[PDB]
Amino acid sequence: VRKLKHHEQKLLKKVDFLEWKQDQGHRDTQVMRTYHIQNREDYHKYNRICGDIRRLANKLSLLPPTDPFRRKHEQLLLDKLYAMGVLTTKSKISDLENKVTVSAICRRRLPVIMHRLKMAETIQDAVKFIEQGHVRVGPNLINDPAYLVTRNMEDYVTWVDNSKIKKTLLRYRNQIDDFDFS
Amino acid sequence: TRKFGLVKRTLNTKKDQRLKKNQENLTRNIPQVSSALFFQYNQAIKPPYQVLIDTNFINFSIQKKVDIVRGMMDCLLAKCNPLITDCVMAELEKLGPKYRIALKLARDPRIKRLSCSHKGTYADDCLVHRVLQHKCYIVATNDAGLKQRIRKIPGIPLMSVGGHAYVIEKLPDVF
Amino acid sequence: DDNMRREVQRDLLLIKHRAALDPKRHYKKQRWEVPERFAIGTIIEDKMNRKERKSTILETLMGDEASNKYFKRKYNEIQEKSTSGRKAHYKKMKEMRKKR
Amino acid sequence: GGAKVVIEPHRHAGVYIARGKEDLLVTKNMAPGESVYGEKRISVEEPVPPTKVEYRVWNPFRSKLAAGIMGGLDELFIAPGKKVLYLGAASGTSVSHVSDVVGPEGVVYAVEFSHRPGRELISMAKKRPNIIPIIEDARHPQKYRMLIGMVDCVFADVAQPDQARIIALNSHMFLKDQGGVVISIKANCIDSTVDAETVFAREVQKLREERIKPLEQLTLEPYERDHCIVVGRYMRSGLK
Amino acid sequence: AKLVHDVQKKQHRERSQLTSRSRYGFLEKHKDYVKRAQDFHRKQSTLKVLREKAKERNPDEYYHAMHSRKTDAKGLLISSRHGDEEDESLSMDQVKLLK
Amino acid sequence: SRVKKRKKYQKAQKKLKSVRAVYSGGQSGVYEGEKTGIKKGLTRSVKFK
Amino acid sequence: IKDMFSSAMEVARFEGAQIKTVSGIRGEIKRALSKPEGHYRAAFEDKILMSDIVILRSW
Amino acid sequence: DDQVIGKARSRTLEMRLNRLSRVNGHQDKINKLEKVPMHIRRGMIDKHVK
Amino acid sequence: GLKVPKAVQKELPFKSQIHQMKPQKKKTYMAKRAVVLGGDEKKARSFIQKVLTISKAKDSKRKEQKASQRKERLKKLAKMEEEKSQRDKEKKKEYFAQN
Amino acid sequence: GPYHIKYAKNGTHLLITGRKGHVASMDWRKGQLRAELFLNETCHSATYLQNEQYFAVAQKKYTFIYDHEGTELHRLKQHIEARHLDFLPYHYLLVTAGETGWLKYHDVSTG
Numbered sequence A: 001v002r003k004l005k006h007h008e009q010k011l012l013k014k015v016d017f018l019e020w021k022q023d024q025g026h027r028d029t030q031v032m033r034t035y036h037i038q039n040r041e042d043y044h045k046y047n048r049i050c051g052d053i054r055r056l057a058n059k060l061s062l063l064p065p066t067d068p069f070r071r072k073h074e075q076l077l078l079d080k081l082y083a084m085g086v087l088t089t090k091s092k093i094s095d096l097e098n099k100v101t102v103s104a105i106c107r108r109r110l111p112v113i114m115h116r117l118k119m120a121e122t123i124q125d126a127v128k129f130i131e132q133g134h135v136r137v138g139p140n141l142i143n144d145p146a147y148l149v150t151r152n153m154e155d156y157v158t159w160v161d162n163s164k165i166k167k168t169l170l171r172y173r174n175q176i177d178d179f180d181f182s
Numbered sequence B: 001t002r003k004f005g006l007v008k009r010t011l012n013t014k015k016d017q018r019l020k021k022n023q024e025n026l027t028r029n030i031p032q033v034s035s036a037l038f039f040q041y042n043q044a045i046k047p048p049y050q051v052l053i054d055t056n057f058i059n060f061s062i063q064k065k066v067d068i069v070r071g072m073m074d075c076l077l078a079k080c081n082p083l084i085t086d087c088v089m090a091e092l093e094k095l096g097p098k099y100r101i102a103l104k105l106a107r108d109p110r111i112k113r114l115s116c117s118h119k120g121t122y123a124d125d126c127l128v129h130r131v132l133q134h135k136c137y138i139v140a141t142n143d144a145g146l147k148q149r150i151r152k153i154p155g156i157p158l159m160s161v162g163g164h165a166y167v168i169e170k171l172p173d174v175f
Numbered sequence C: 001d002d003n004m005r006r007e008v009q010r011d012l013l014l015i016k017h018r019a020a021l022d023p024k025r026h027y028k029k030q031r032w033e034v035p036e037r038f039a040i041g042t043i044i045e046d047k048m049n050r051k052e053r054k055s056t057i058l059e060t061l062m063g064d065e066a067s068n069k070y071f072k073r074k075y076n077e078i079q080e081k082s083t084s085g086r087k088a089h090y091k092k093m094k095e096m097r098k099k100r
Numbered sequence D: 001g002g003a004k005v006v007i008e009p010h011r012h013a014g015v016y017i018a019r020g021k022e023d024l025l026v027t028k029n030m031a032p033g034e035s036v037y038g039e040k041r042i043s044v045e046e047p048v049p050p051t052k053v054e055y056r057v058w059n060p061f062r063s064k065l066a067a068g069i070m071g072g073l074d075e076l077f078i079a080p081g082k083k084v085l086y087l088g089a090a091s092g093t094s095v096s097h098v099s100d101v102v103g104p105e106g107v108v109y110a111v112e113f114s115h116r117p118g119r120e121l122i123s124m125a126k127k128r129p130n131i132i133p134i135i136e137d138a139r140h141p142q143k144y145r146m147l148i149g150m151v152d153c154v155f156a157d158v159a160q161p162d163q164a165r166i167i168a169l170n171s172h173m174f175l176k177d178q179g180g181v182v183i184s185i186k187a188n189c190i191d192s193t194v195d196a197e198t199v200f201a202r203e204v205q206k207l208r209e210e211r212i213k214p215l216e217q218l219t220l221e222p223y224e225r226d227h228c229i230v231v232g233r234y235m236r237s238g239l240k
Numbered sequence E: 001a002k003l004v005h006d007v008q009k010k011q012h013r014e015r016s017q018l019t020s021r022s023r024y025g026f027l028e029k030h031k032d033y034v035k036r037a038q039d040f041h042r043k044q045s046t047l048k049v050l051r052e053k054a055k056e057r058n059p060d061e062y063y064h065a066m067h068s069r070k071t072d073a074k075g076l077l078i079s080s081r082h083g084d085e086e087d088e089s090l091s092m093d094q095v096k097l098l099k
Numbered sequence F: 001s002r003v004k005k006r007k008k009y010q011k012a013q014k015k016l017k018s019v020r021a022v023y024s025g026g027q028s029g030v031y032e033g034e035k036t037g038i039k040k041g042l043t044r045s046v047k048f049k
Numbered sequence G: 001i002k003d004m005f006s007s008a009m010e011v012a013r014f015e016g017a018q019i020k021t022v023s024g025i026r027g028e029i030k031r032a033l034s035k036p037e038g039h040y041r042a043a044f045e046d047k048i049l050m051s052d053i054v055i056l057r058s059w
Numbered sequence H: 001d002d003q004v005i006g007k008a009r010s011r012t013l014e015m016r017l018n019r020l021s022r023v024n025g026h027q028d029k030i031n032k033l034e035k036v037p038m039h040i041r042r043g044m045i046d047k048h049v050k
Numbered sequence I: 001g002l003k004v005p006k007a008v009q010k011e012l013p014f015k016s017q018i019h020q021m022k023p024q025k026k027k028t029y030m031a032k033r034a035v036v037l038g039g040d041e042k043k044a045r046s047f048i049q050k051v052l053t054i055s056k057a058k059d060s061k062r063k064e065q066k067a068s069q070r071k072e073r074l075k076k077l078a079k080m081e082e083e084k085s086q087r088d089k090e091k092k093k094e095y096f097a098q099n
Numbered sequence J: 001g002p003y004h005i006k007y008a009k010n011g012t013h014l015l016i017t018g019r020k021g022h023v024a025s026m027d028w029r030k031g032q033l034r035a036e037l038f039l040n041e042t043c044h045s046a047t048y049l050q051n052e053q054y055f056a057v058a059q060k061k062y063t064f065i066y067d068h069e070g071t072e073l074h075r076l077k078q079h080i081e082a083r084h085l086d087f088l089p090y091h092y093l094l095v096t097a098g099e100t101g102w103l104k105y106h107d108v109s110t111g
C-alpha cells in the first residue's frame, strides 16, 4: 500500500489488498466490463448455467464412446446451444467443454446483438437506447438489456416505429415518408 | 436527471495502477566500429601480445604438458603476457581440490592478473565483454561455445590447445 | 509564436529539405521535424560582402544563379517524366486514330 | 560568412545545434560580443526591447569535448547548474565553452600549471565570472584543497602519462559520489611503446581500480587520431 | 552462367508495330498485357467488394454522424469541399469586417 | 595483377569510410561546419558491459 | 478479325483453330462472318486491343 | 471399451494416450506434473512414502 | 482511376460511403476577395515548389532503389538459408545414425 | 431504511449502512464524505477493515469489500449470508456470522 521496501517485500510476500485468489482474476468484473453488464450477479447467474452445461458434458463424455444415449444427448445439447446462439458451430463435442463460456452467453445479449447488427455504435449506446425504449423484437418493445436474442429471433430486432432514431436515419438518406409516422 | 446505462464501479485490472502488473506507466546507440580494425584484420595489435586465458585452457595445457608462457611464445613466436581475470581464478578455485595442480599453476608470478568488477564469476561473459570492448587481446580458450562466440566477433585472435602445442586462429601474422 | 512561424515557414522548409538543394552535398539521414522552440540567427564574422548579406536563406538561394538553373532543369525533367503517359499522351493516341 | 542559421537545442542540456546548409555546434556566450579564440559567432535577437544575445561556435577540431559531443556521447555530466573541475585547462579554449555550457549559476574550476596559459586564464575569467582559474600543479591536490569543494563533474584533458593517478587524487578529494568523470586520453602521449587500444584498456582498468566505474568510451576518430574519451561515474562504494 | 556461352545467352531484340498499322500506336507485348490485365483485376476486385457491402447494408444502421452528414437528392453523399473545420456561411458581423 | 590490387585497395579504403569514420588528416582550413549534418539522437559510442 | 483469310470457305476450312495475339492472349476461331468475306469471330482469353496482331501458327 | 463407465474410462483413456505418446514425444513434455506448491508436494511425497 | 457506380455508391453503408466532393461552379466571395502577392513573392512560391518537388522525386527514387536492393539480397539470402537448412537436416540425421 | 452505524477504530470516520441500499463512508467531523453508494439490494451491516481505506458491507447475501472511494474490490463467494461483520485489527481478520449457522474468519491481508 506504500510500495514496500525490500526487507518488507521479502517478509510479507503474500500480502495483496486488491487481487485475492478467490477473485479468480476478476473475470466477473472483466467480462462484465467488456459487455457492459448492468447488475453484478448476471455473470454468476450465467456461470451457474455454464457450469451445468460443462458438468453434463463431462458426465456425458464419461459414457462409452459408442452408445446411442451418449451420441444422441450430445447432439441434442449441441444443437440446442447452437440454436440458442451460445455456441458458434456444432462441429465437435469438445466445444461443449472448451467453448461454452459466460462471455459466449453474454455475446448473445440484446445490446451486443444490436452492436453487431450495427444498430448502435457501441454496447454502452445500445444499452442506453434500449433503456430509453427504442428497440423492439418483433412487435413488442424490449426494455431490459439482459434479453437473450437467439438465432431465429435476431431477424426481428428493429427499432420501434415513431422512434426519433428511425426518423433520423430515414431522413439522413432522405427517404423519410411522413405518411406512416416515420 | 439520472444517467443512462448505469453500472457499478469495480476495480479495473487492465487500467488500475494500484496493482502489480500495471506498475509501469529518444537516444539510439549504434556502437562505432573499432578504429583498431581494418575490415577484418585488426591492424593495430602488435607484440607483446596480451592473452586472456580461461579455465579449460589451463586444464588442457596441464593435460597436454605445454607450459603457459613458453607455449604461447612458441605458438606466436613473440612475447606474451598471459592474463587471468578474477572470474577465471574464481572458477579454478571453485572447481575443487581435484584441480589444486591447476590452481597453483595458474598462481604463477609470470601470469599477470586483471581484476574484473562485476557480480558473480561467469568467465565466458567476462572474457567476451572485455574482448569486444577493446580489440587488443587474444582469447586463449578451448570451450566450444566460447570459441564460437569469439570466432564470430571480428578482429579477435583465438588461441587453443590442439594436439601437442598451441594453435592460433584469427591472427594473420604467425609466420 | 505563430506570428513568427508564419514568417519563417520557408527557410525551415529549406533546412528540412537540404538534401535537394545541391546535387553534390548528400546529407546524412535525419527527418528534422520543426522544433517547438528555436531562434533564427545571423553569423557574426569577426574582424560575403555587405551587398550580398540577406534576410533569409531563401533569398540567398534565389540570388544564387547556377542553382536556379539546376532547379529549373531538374524540375522540368521531373515534370516531363511525371506527365509522360497520362492524358495528353492518351488523347494524342486517340486523335492519331481519329485523324486518318 | 553572413548567412542565416536556426538555433535548436541538443540532447545535452546547455549546448545547441545551428542548422543551415552545414550545421554547427554552438553554445551560449557568457561574455557576449567578444570571441575567445577567433571563432565565428551567431547573434539571435531574443524578444521592453528585443535583446541581442549571441552564441558561439564550438570547433571540434580544436576541442576534445566538442569532438566527443558531436561524435556522440550518451551522458556528459556537464549541465547548466553544475560545478566542474576542469583539469588541464590548457588555455581558455575549451574552458570557455565548458563555462557557458555550465551557465551563470554554476562554477568551472580551471586548473592549469603553466604561467603564460595562467595569465590567459585570468584575463578570460574576468569577463567569464564563473571560471575560477587555479594556477597549481594538479598532481598535488592538497595545495588547492583550500580553494575548491565538492564539484559535480571532473573533466580531465591533461597530457601526462600518470593521468589516471592525477584524476584519482582530484576525484577522491573533490568529486562527490556518483559524480561525473570525463577523461581525454591521448595514446601516443601516454606511451608510444604500445598500441592505442592497449593503452586505452590499461587506463580504463586503472579507472575502475580507483573506483571510477567507466560507462562509455569514444574514439573521436575524424577529428583526432588515437585519442579517446572515457566517461565514468565515481561510484565510491561498490562498482558492482 | 555455368556451362553457357556468352554467344549462347545473347539478347533477342523485340519487334515494332507494323508500318501500315501505325495509327493504333504501340503494338503491345506480354509485359504490357499483364500491366493491363492485373490492373483491371484489382479494380474488379474492389468493385466486387463494394457490391457485397451494398447487398449486406442492414438498413437499421445508426451512426451518430448522420446528424451532420447529409445526402443529396440523387442519393449520394454531400461532402462539403471547404473544411468541415470552418463554417461555410460567414455571419453578418464577419462579412462586415471582411468587406 | 598489380593494378588489380592497386584498385581493389582504392575500393577498399573507400568502403572503410562507410563503416568507420576515418581520420582524414585534421582540419583543412577555416572551420566551415559539419557539412553533412549533426544528429542529436544517435550516440555512437561503446557502452561498457 | 479482319484479314487473314480471303473468304468464308477458307474460314470454314480453318474453324476451331487456336490463335493468339502478340501479347500472348490466347483465343480460338469461332465462326466465319457472313457479310464481309474474309472476316471471322474469335473468342479470346480477355479483351484484346485494337493495336494487336492475331496469329495462327501452321506448318 | 464400449462397457467402461466413467472414472475408469477417463483414466484408462489417459493411460493409453500417455503410453502411446511416450515413444515419439519429448520426455520433458509428455509428463507434465500438476503445479503443486513446495510445502504440500513435499508433504504428499513424505506421507506417500510412509 | 476506379470509377464506382452511382447505383452502388448510393447504396453503400454508412461507414463505406465514398466522400466525393463536387467542383465549384460559382465564383464565390472569399475566392474573389483573397489576395495573392506578386513579383518577388511569386518567384518565392515557384522556388519553394521546385525545391519540394525535387526533394520528393529524390526521396521516391532513393526508396525505390532501396527496394530493388533488398529484394535481390532477399532472394540470395533465401538461397543461403535453404542451403544451411539442408546441411542442418543432413547433419542431424547423421547424428542420429551415429547415436 | 434503518441505518446501521459504525465508526472507525479511532474517532475519525463514520460508515452508515441503510437497510434499503445506502452505504456511506464519511469524515463525520469534517464534512467530507469519501464514499456514497446506493447498492440497490438490502444491505445489513458494515465495518471498516483496518483504516478508513477499505470497508466491508454485508449485502443481500454476499459480503463485499469496497475501497476508500467506493469501488468494489472483492465479492466474497463464501460468507453466504452475513448479517454481523466484525474486524480483528491486530490479527487482520474479518469475522462474519449470519443466517447460515457458520462463523467465518477471512484473513484480509493475504486474502
Ligand SMILES: [Zn+2]
Binding pocket: B085, B086, B087, B088, B116, B117, B118, B121, B122, B123, B126, B127
Ligand atoms: Zn570476470
